[PDB]
Amino acid sequence: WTATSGSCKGRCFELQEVGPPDCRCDNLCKSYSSCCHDFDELCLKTARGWECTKDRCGEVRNEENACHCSEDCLSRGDCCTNYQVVCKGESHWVDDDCEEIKVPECPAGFVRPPLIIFSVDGFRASYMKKGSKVMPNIEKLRSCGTHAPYMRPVYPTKTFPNLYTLATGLYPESHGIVGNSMYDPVFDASFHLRGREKFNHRWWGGQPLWITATKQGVRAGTFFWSVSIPHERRILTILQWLSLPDNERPSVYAFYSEQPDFSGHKYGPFGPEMTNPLREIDKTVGQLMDGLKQLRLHRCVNVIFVGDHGMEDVTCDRTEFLSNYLTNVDDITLVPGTLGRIRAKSINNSKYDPKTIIAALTCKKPDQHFKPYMKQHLPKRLHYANNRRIEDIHLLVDRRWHVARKPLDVYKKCFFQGDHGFDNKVNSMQTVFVGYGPTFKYRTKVPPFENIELYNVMCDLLGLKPAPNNGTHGSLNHLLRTNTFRPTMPDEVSRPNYPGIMYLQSEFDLGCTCDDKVENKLEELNKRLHTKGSTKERHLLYGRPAVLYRTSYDILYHTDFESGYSEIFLMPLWTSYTISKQAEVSSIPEHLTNCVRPDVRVSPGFSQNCLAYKNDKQMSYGFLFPPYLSSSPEAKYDAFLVTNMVPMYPAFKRVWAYFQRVLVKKYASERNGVNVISGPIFDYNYDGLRDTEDEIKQYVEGSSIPVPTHYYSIITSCLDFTQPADKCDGPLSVSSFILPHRPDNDESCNSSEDESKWVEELMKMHTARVRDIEHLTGLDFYRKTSRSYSEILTLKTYLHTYESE
Ligand SMILES: *[C@@H]1O[C@H](CO)[C@@H](O[C@@H]2O[C@H](CO)[C@@H](O[C@@H]3O[C@H](CO[C@H]4O[C@H](CO)[C@@H](O)[C@H](O[C@H]5O[C@H](CO)[C@@H](O)[C@H](O)[C@@H]5O[C@H]5O[C@H](CO)[C@@H](O)[C@H](O)[C@@H]5O)[C@@H]4O)[C@@H](O)[C@H](O[C@H]4O[C@H](CO)[C@@H](O)[C@H](O)[C@@H]4O[C@H]4O[C@H](CO)[C@@H](O)[C@H](O)[C@@H]4O)[C@@H]3O)[C@H](O)[C@H]2NC(C)=O)[C@H](O)[C@H]1NC(C)=O
Ligand SMILES: O=C(CCc1cnn[nH]1)N1C[C@H]2CN(C(=O)c3cc(OCC4CCOCC4)nc(C4CC4)c3)C[C@@H]2C1
Ligand SMILES: [Ca+2]
Ligand SMILES: [Ca+2]
Ligand SMILES: [Cl-]
Ligand SMILES: [K+]
Ligand code: NA
Ligand SMILES: [Zn+2]
Numbered sequence: 120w121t122a123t124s125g126s127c128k129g130r131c132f133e134l135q136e137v138g139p140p141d142c143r144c145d146n147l148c149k150s151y152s153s154c155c156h157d158f159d160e161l162c163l164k165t166a167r168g169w170e171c172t173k174d175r176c177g178e179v180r181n182e183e184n185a186c187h188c189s190e191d192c193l194s195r196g197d198c199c200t201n202y203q204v205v206c207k208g209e210s211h212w213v214d215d216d217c218e219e220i221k222v223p224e225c226p227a228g229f230v231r232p233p234l235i236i237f238s239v240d241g242f243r244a245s246y247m248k249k250g251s252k253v254m255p256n257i258e259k260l261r262s263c264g265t266h267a268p269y270m271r272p273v274y275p276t277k278t279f280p281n282l283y284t285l286a287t288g289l290y291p292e293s294h295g296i297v298g299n300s301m302y303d304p305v306f307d308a309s310f311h312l313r314g315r316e317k318f319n320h321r322w323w324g325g326q327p328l329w330i331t332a333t334k335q336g337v338r339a340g341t342f343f344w345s346v347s348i349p350h351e352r353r354i355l356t357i358l359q360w361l362s363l364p365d366n367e368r369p370s371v372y373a374f375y376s377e378q379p380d381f382s383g384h385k386y387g388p389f390g391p392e393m394t395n396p397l398r399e400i401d402k403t404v405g406q407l408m409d410g411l412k413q414l415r416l417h418r419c420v421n422v423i424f425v426g427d428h429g430m431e432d433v434t435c436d437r438t439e440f441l442s443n444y445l446t447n448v449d450d451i452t453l454v455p456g457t458l459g460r461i462r463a464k465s466i467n468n469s470k471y472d473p474k475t476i477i478a479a480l481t482c483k484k485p486d487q488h489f490k491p492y493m494k495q496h497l498p499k500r501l502h503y504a505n506n507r508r509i510e511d512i513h514l515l516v517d518r519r520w521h522v523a524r525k526p527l528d529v530y531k532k533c534f535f536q537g538d539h540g541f542d543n544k545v546n547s548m549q550t551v552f553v554g555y556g557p558t559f560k561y562r563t564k565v566p567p568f569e570n571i572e573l574y575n576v577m578c579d580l581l582g583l584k585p586a587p588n589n590g591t592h593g594s595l596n597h598l599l600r601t602n603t604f605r606p607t608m609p610d611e612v613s614r615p616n617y618p619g620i621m622y623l624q625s626e627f628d629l630g631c632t633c634d635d636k637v638e639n640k641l642e643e644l645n646k647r648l649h650t651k652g653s654t655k656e657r658h659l660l661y662g663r664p665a666v667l668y669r670t671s672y673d674i675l676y677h678t679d680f681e682s683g684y685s686e687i688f689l690m691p692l693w694t695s696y697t698i699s700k701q702a703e704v705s706s707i708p709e710h711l712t713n714c715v716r717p718d719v720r721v722s723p724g725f726s727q728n729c730l731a732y733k734n735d736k737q738m739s740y741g742f743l744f745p746p747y748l749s750s751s752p753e754a755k756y757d758a759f760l761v762t763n764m765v766p767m768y769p770a771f772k773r774v775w776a777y778f779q780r781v782l783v784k785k786y787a788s789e790r791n792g793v794n795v796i797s798g799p800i801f802d803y804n805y806d807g808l809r810d811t812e813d814e815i816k817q818y819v820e821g822s823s824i825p826v827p828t829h830y831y832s833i834i835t836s837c838l839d840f841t842q843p844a845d846k847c848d849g850p851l852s853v854s855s856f857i858l859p860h861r862p863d864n865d866e867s868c869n870s871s872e873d874e875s876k877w878v879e880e881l882m883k884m885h886t887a888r889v890r891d892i893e894h895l896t897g898l899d900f901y902r903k904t905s906r907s908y909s910e911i912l913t914l915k916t917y918l919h920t921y922e923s924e
Contacts, residue, residue, distance in 0.1 A: 121153040130155075131162035132356045134341060134369070146356065149345035151318075169351040169406075171199045176206035186355055193413065196362025200354065200410040212408035212417060213256045217263035221600075223557040225419035228365040232557050233416070234580050235357070235372045236423045237407070238285065239400060240278060241380025241539065243388055243429035244269030244549040250397040256404040257553070260424055263562060264555030265598050271569045271918070272428040274501040275458050275540045276548040278380070279317075281427035281570065286327035286342075288574030288588030290502040290807075295324040297508045300454055302462070304507060326586035328577055332371055335583050340372035350376065350403045358410040371581055374407070376400055380539075383430035387536035388547065421556030421580050425573070428539045431518050431547035433457065435533030439488050439516075442525040444479050451476065453524040457540030459489060459514030473512055480514070482868040488520040490866070495805040498885050499829065499857045499895070500918065501543070502589075504805040518545045544886075544920045560600050568595060568916065579604055591890055594912035608908065609899050611665035615674040615683060618720040620650075627723045630730030633714035635756055642753075650720075652676040657845055659695045660794045661835065662903025666692070668809070675720060675762055678754040680744035682763065686725040687812060689824050690765050693798040693898060694743035697845050698787040704780065707746050711759065715740075718762040726761050727824050735820035737862060741767040743797050745779030765799055766819050766826050768862040774881060775830065775858075777874035782882075783834075790836035790852070792844030799827035800857060800895045809897040831857045831892045833900065850906065854919035857887040857895065889915040 120140050127144035136145045139153070144162060148154035164185045167175075175188035185199075188206060192198035203209035223232045247266075251258050260266075273284045273291055277299045280291040291297045301310040301322075310317050329339040340360055344353050357372050378396040386392040404424070411417040441459075442448045450471055454460040463471035473493070480491040492513045494504040503509060516522050518541045523529050541548055549567075558580050575592040578585040579602045585592065596603040659681045666672065671686045680696035715729050732740050742763045749755035757763070767775060787793045801810040803817075815825040833855045837847030858881070864870035869877040889900055893915065901911045 121151075123154070123156050125155045127155045127158045127161045131158075132341075132359070134338075134360075134367075136341070146341050146344050146348065146353075149347055150343075163348065163352060169199060171202045171205040173205060185352070196359050196414075197355070198413060200358070200406040200413070203413050204409065209412070211405065212412045213259050213405055217259065217562070219561040220418050220557045223419050224415075226415055229419060230365070231370060231582060232580070233361065233370050233372065233420045234423070234577060235374070235407070235420055236425065236577070237374045237376075237404065238282065239376045239379065239424070239426050239551070241378075241383045241428065241430045241537075242400075242426035242551050243379075243383075243547065244426075244551055245429075245546075246379070246397060247551055249389070250394070253394055253398045254401040254404075256401050256408060257424060260404070260422065260555045261553045264422075264553055265559040265561075265563045265565060266553045267551075267565050267567050269549035269567050270425070270552040271567060272426075272543050272548060272550055273570060274503050274543040276428035276543050276545075277457075277540045278427055279312075282375075283323065283325075283327070284570055285425065285427065285573060286329075287325035288571055288585060288590040289325045290571065290589050292502055292504060292506040292509065293325060293589065295322055295506060295508065297503070297506050298454060298458075298460070301508045302452075325588070328371065328574060329373075331578060331583050331586055332581060337371065337581050337583060338367075338369040340369040342373035342375075344375060346377065350374075350399075351406065354403060354406050354410060357407070358414065361411075361414055361416060371577075374403075376403065380427075380430065383537040384535050385537070387432045388430040390536060418557065421554065421558045423573075423577070424551065424553040424555075425570075426550030426552075428543075429546075429548045429550050430537045430539050431457075431541060431545070432536065433519055433521060433538035434536055435521075435529055437488070437519055438521040438523050438526075438529050440523055440526055441480075444483055445476065446479075448524060451524070453522070454510070455523045455528065456521055457516050457538050459491075459512075459516060459522045460510040461512035461514070462510045476512060481865055487868070488517040489514045489522050492866075495828075496859055496861070496866070498887075499802075499807065499891055500885070500887050502807055502891075505807065515542060516540075518542075518547060544918075544922060546922045554598055558600055558602055559598060563598075565595075565598055566913070566917075568913075569918070572916065575604070591912050591916050593909045594916045596909040597913065603909070606908065606912070608902065609665065609667050611899075612668055613666040613670045613672065615663070615666075615672055618673050618675075620719050622717070622719045622722060624717055624719065627717040627726070629715070629717060629723065629726060629728035629761065630733065631715035631717065631728070631761060633716045633756075633759060634710040635714065635716060635759075646678075649678040650676055652681070654678055655681050658697050658794075660697060660845060661851075661901045663695075664693050664796070664898040664900050665902055666897065667899055668897040673721065675718070677744075677757040677760075679748070679750050679757060680763075682743065684721065684762050686721075688799070688801075689725065689727050691743055691762070691798055692896065693796050694763065695794070695796045696744050696748070697792065697794045698748055698783055699792045699843060699845065700787055702748060702750075702784065702787060704747050704784050705749060705755070708752075708755075711746075711755070714756075714759045715761055715764060716756065716759050718760045721762055727764055727819075728761075728822065731819045731822035731824055732766070737768065738766050738819050738826065739769050739772060740764045741772050741775050742779075745783065747780045748783060765830070766824055768860065770862055770864050771830075771858075771860050773864065773870075773874060774878050777878045778832070778882065781874075782879065786834055786836075787844075790834075790844065791840045791842065792836060794835045794844050795832055796835075796900065797830065797832040798896065798898075799860075800829035800831055800892070801825060802828050802895055807891070807894050809895055827860050829857050829860055829895070831855065831887065831895070833889055833892060848905075850910065851901075851904070851914055853889060853914055853917055855887045855889055855892060856882050856885050857891060858882060858885050883921040886919050886921065888918050 125142040130144035142155035171188035180189040572590040575590040682691040746758035836844040838850040
């Protein structure tokens with residue numbers, strides 16, 4: 120109940136919201152059916168429109184007008200945004216030359232440059248080039264300020280998950296807004312686009328920017344606008360707030376546009392109808408910038424122009440129906456569209472079986488346009504599993520397609536020509552970032568980055584300490600002229616042991632054998648040097664990774680590779696090796712096919728054993744440093760050490776062997792040498808973070824050898840590929856992957872073919888940032904380079920996406 124009989128007189132767009140049943144006058148009151156009786160009359164004036172004309176100049180203030188052109192309007196803070204242009208011979212902001220803003224030029228009483236965040240729904244990255252002709256204000260922000268060619272959204276590339284990631288720096292699995300539609304089984308409650316449930320605070324986790332600011336004594340404009348408040352009024356309200364006295368004036372403001380998303384759904388991303396919405400958004404930017412110029416704030420405020428996600432061509436005829444795969448289609452609930460999420464329709468139905476639903480959805484039709492996954496098997500780069508609101512069964516839908524349960528759903532709910540929500544690597548889903556102002560750099564292009572990084576920067580711009588988030592603070596320092604955040608590298612927690620030869624061969628009873636009994640002062644010196652680290656500078660190019668948790672591990676040196684060997688997990692945490700452009704691939708000699716060799720530096724008790732692998736009928740083993748890339752027949756024996764072995768499903772060894780035998784050499788050819796760091800990952804609770812031993816759900820049968828959920832590789836070379844990876848003077852280039860360690864290759868529909876037709880495609884799907892691997896392993900890489908730490912943080916956030924131009 121609202122007592123709507125109060126009044127908005129002098130309260131129009133008031134900043135502190137009043138609690139029921141008192142009536143509201145804030146920018147959200149409409150959305151709650153709670154505005155005072157006179158809110159439209161007082162607060163949403165429209166008389167005479169939004170622009171001054173010659174004949175209104177110096178008019179007698181008529182308080183009924185939407186905005187004013189009278190002499191007192193500047194001191195009142197309510198001129199039409201074009202007042203000075205029409206009446207005082209001023210130029211529009213867009214017509215002025217770009218002039219560097221070296222320092223904030225702010226009115227007296229401004230404690231800090233205000234931040235204005237102008238967010239545009241469905242603004243596809245390539246609009247910046249393709250619509251450039253019709254967006255002069257936006258093109259001026261872009262060219263004069265700091266811009267990226269695109270900004271990567273989070274998955275799913277839906278509105279609320281992305282807007283809330285922008286607000287919090289968190290992945291959707293952490294902030295809780297995991298879709299535009301959700302069921303939370305703990306609350307037994309549903310979140311929907313339409314309706315009241317979405318307003319309840321229990322959905323919204325983390326700490327969004329407006330709350331961070333308020334806790335730290337920075338005042339925030341109310342960020343949200345009821346849909347029916349026109350854009351012109353939103354802008355005028357912002358400009359009026361900026362004229363408040365110092366102690367009342369917010370320091371951060373948000374404007375949100377429903378366009379171009381609204382038209383893009385109806386017309387497709389490049390429909391001829393899309394020109395007009397782009398022109399209109401540009402005009403709104405123009406109004407804001409002119410308004411700021413009138414207030415003498417255009418060289419004071421930092422402006423961020425940012426999108427939530429892009430827009431792809433999607434029509435009703437490109438829908439897959441679960442009713443064409445499943446017999447029991449009525450026993451499931453599907454969240455449908457550009458992603459699928461499946462759960463049982465009834466929790467009382469004990470013949471619901473996810474195993475058989477996944478199987479019935481797997482590689483069933485030659486050109487199938489979605490792939491099913493248990494959520495824990497989704498590419499780790501999506502960070503889309505650790506929330507009870509995300510259903511165990513997920514469908515990754517191909518770009519340009521939808522999934523629905525039954526055909527009747529698509530016509531008893533073609534209308535639409537555009538949609539979004541697909542994998543956040545997809546080109547059409549990318550969106551925009553421009554920063555303009557004293558704190559941003561001048562005429563600077565920066566590489567693409569992820570939207571999870573922006574909260575930290577918005578906090579930097581306001582001098583706030585960010586709440587704990589998923590950005591990597593400092594990785595976007597290169598966007599900023601000042602207010603950079605200068606982190607220190609994390610402290611190493613565990614120091615390595617450096618074992619020498621401590622065990623005789625006969626102390627080992629591992630059930631391993633090797634044909635290695637063949638018997639030189641010239642080369643005995645050499646092998647000793649190699650075991651003491653003489654080639655370490657060749658194979659460990661960026662320092663040893665730091666271990667950021669408490670554990671017991673050994674560094675092991677070899678001719679061709681160096682490793683950090685965990686006495687707790689019985690295998691390396693990491694294995695580092697460099698392969699030059701000139702390296703040759705060799706085979707595993709016949710007599711060495713089953714060879715595994717005790718490592719006399721490492722106790723029997725801290726070693727794997729071959730008997731466990733023999734007894735475990737499901738599990739085999741692979742090597743981290745590949746025997747195919749040994750530098751010589753004698754060095755090859757090192758690759759068969761028990762300490763270089765890791766457990767592998769035969770199905771996965773198909774993937775791994777092709778990566779090691781074919782792909783590493785290919786990359787070293789193309790990149791002029793590569794340095795490779797590979798290792799296991801254990802993430803049995805799918806939280807994206809290194810498991811402790813007590814979280815491991817599977818061991819090699821009859822042993823304490825833990826089975827990895829994933830295997831990673833980090834592949835580094837020189838950005839200037841005229842320099843070899845091991846003699847690089849400047850910036851680095853990296854690609855990485857986190858491959859799921861699966862007992863079948865059901866994910867790859869073409870896996871009965873030769874590895875050359877499917878393995879590299881799989882690896883590309885599981886591309887990763889170094890930072891993702893850091894979370895998953897508790898390691899910190901690139902500790903010793905010649906590069907600045909901020910540059911290294913940017914490198915660690917890099918994602919190689921394999922999308923075309
Ligand atoms: C991305 O960045 C984020 C933010 O930094 C990272 O997430 C953090 O990770 C931490 C480690 O996982 C985690 O720390 C835990 O916090 C527990 C208290 O949590 C509450 O308080 C905070 C502070 O305000 C709040 O933010 C939390 O918000 C979560 O939960 C509410 C609902 O309750 C949601 O609204 C919100 O969306 C958010 O949910 C997300 O996180 C939770 C986990 O907290 C998930 O379950 C959700 O799915 C969702 O993803 C909370 O309100 C604290 O109690 C924990 O300590 C327990 O666990 C440890 C180790 O397991 C142990 O040492 C302790 O003894 C204790 O265990 C006891 O409880 C266990 C569980 O019942 C029980 O099994 C034991 O036997 C014990 O009794 C722990 O310290 C932190 O909360 C989140 N923060 C956020 C915002 O998500 C994230 O890791 C980053 N991702 C990557 C890939 O890097
Ligand atoms: O009607 C549809 C959806 C229609 C649609 C589009 N595509 N499919 N359906 N609306 C979607 C609603 C979103 N909205 C907002 O006012 C809004 C803005 C915002 O900004 C955060 C800032 C963004 C910039 O960085 C700082 C954080 N954050 C939130 C929610 C997350 C807290 C909401 C009105 C719209 C009505
Ligand atoms: Ca959106
Ligand atoms: Ca984990
Ligand atoms: Cl959704
Ligand atoms: K076996
Ligand atoms: Na297959
Ligand atoms: Zn949309």
